[PDB]
Amino acid sequence: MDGVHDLAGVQGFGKVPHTVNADIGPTFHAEWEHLPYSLMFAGVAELGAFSVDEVRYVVERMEPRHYMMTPYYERYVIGVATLMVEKGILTQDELESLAGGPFPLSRPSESEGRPAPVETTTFEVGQRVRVRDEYVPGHIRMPAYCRGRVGTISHRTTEKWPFPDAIGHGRNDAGEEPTYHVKFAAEELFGSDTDGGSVVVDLFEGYLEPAA
């Protein structure tokens, strides 16, 4: 999904709000802030109502301006609440009643997702690969900066996981795939307009193809 959450490479932001080893304060800076992750785990492990990938996607489905002005932990409050309503566990009415006021949620999905690709390749360390030049409207764990770009494999995972573009929509056809650490030269991704050296993206097998 080419949403505003895909921020890598956007220009115009200012300084990162941190100096190395500065005090970052306590883990939680408000008494509610442990609730979004804890209730996410409740939903995944105790209720079996959704996957972690569905939480990433429902946060990507926040209305774009809403995403941009909402603090991190609050995005996950909104996301988990949205999934609880979508999965039929809660209603928006009871959430607003309890909250004493408006509780706008993420927007409905505009994609049903897609299955784990039927045809993929097992790649080896050192091989050159291209990120598939594909556009996916639903969830995908490919940041747009690397779409269509070529890099080299530095690692193939020894474990396999459900394809995000499927499990992120709650589909039954996510299968399992390994991922690959793909190393890109900075100039491959941003031409001369970078000060970096290389970028390694951890890409599902189904996002890749041989570079020839």
Partner: protein, 198 residues
């Protein structure tokens, strides 16, 4: 007005409403969120990654295990966990500086780095470090010479990373405890280099 924020109840009211709506239906076990709060605050900690770095700095065989099978090395210490089941450690060298981000959200090796800090989840870091890591690090107080390649790891799948920083000179013969103290959260993320007093 145009581009205005939607009306919203106070976020604390909304978060606690979410809790109460679920808890009142019996869907949240007794002490379940309190238990996670404690795990997040007390167990998941960059002190664990600092222990791993100090061990690697003084034990070549563990260093090699950590760099080839990070999951195995971490499991020896009992520190596998949520968002820390498939661990890869990346080695800084005199010509390479590694840095970790999650440009799409906040993905972090929770059990050995601790939950990510606010700044790592900022739009500034997520947008900028992938494209201009040298300037970001510099702004953050870390100068990386032009002779060093900077390599940014974008945590886009299930791999969870930690940086193994260079051991600085002036620490020869130090104990594991002494070494652990100078390996901070920021050194494990990759934006800082361990410092020794003079």
């Amino acid at each position: 007005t145009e581009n205005a924020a939607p009306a919203q109840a106070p976020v604390s009211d909304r978060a606690w409403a979410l809790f109460r709506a679920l808890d009142g239906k019996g869907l949240v076990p007794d002490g379940y969120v309190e238990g996670w709060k404690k795990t997040f605050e007390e167990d998941f900690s960059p002190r664990r990654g600092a222990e791993l770095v100090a061990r690697a700095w003084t034990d070549p065989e563990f260093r090699q295990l950590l760099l080839t099978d990070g999951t195995a090395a971490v499991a020896q210490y009992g520190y596998l966990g949520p968002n820390g089941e498939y661990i890869v450690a990346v080695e800084d060298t005199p010509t390479l500086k590694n840095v970790i981000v999650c440009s799409l959200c906040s993905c972090t090796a929770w059990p050995i780095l601790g939950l990510p800090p606010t700044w790592y989840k900022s739009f500034e870091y997520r947008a900028r470090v992938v494209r201009e890591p040298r300037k970001v690090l510099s702004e953050m107080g870390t100068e990386i010479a032009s002779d060093i390649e900077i390599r940014v790891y974008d945590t886009t799948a299930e791999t969870r990373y930690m940086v193994l920083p260079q051991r600085p000179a002036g620490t020869e013969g130090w104990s594991q405890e002494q070494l652990q103290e100078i390996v901070t959260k920021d050194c494990l993320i990759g934006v800082a280099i361990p410092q020794v007093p003079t």
